Amino acid sequence: AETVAPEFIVKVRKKLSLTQKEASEIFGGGVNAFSRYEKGNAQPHPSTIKLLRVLDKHPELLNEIR
Amino acid sequence: AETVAPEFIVKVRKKLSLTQKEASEIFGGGVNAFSRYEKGNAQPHPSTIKLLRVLDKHPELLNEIR
């Protein structure tokens, strides 16, 4: 499974001007998902990692998914 | 949770020239994930749905994630 640095998750979430709660709602994983991901205590779903990588490069795509 | 038609999943997977096995590896969900999704017998992760919607519009983004 592709892995991801917790710091990368924080970076992209903040670039998108999302709260942890909002990110968890949009990307899935349950209410406290991003809180755990950003502490390195859970692994996001592979699709969450890949979607975050896409959004890091093309943040305007948030308007297509939110 | 946003829902998705099984036919949409098939459409995007085939547009991307992926097998069910390849899609399951790239997007996650386990080996038989797409087999189940395309029969309507499991719900993809929210990030999988959103990433498929992005790829339907911008299929070239497969090169950023594969």
Residue numbers in the entry:
A (entry chain A), B (entry chain A): 66 to 131
What text appears in the publication on this structure?
Our biochemical and structural analysis of the E. coli MqsA antitoxin and the MqsR:MqsA-N complex provide a detailed 3-dimensional structural view of the free antitoxin and the TA complex. These structures combined with our biochemical data unequivocally demonstrate that MqsR, a protein previously shown to be critical for biofilm formation and the most highly upregulated gene in persister cells in E. coli, and MqsA form a novel bacterial TA system. Our data show that, as expected for a TA system, the expression of the MqsR toxin leads to growth arrest, while co-expression with its antitoxin, MqsA, rescues the growth arrest phenotype. MqsA itself is a two-domain protein with a novel fold that, unlike every other antitoxin, is well-ordered throughout its entire sequence and whose structure does not change upon toxin binding.
MqsA-C, the helix-turn-helix (HTH) domain, is composed of five tightly packed α-helices, which bury a central hydrophobic core. Of these, all but one (Val69) are perfectly conserved among the MqsA family. Structural similarity searches demonstrated that MqsA-C shows significant homology to the bacteriophage 434 Cro repressor, the P22 C2 repressor and HigA antitoxin, placing it in HTH-XRE family of DNA binding proteins. The MqsA C-terminal domain is necessary and sufficient for binding the mqsR promoter (PmqsR), as incubation of PmqsR with MqsA-C results in a shift in the electrophoretic mobility of the DNA. In contrast, no shift is observed when the DNA is incubated with either MqsA-N alone or the MqsR:MqsA-N complex. These results show that DNA binding is mediated exclusively by MqsA-C. MqsA is the first antitoxin that has been shown experimentally to bind DNA via its C-terminal domain. In MqsA, the HTH-XRE DNA binding helix corresponds to α-helix 4 (α-helix 4 highlighted in green). Moreover, MqsA α-helix 4 is the only stretch of residues that is perfectly conserved among all MqsA proteins. Taken together, these data provide strong evidence that MqsA binds DNA via α-helix 4.
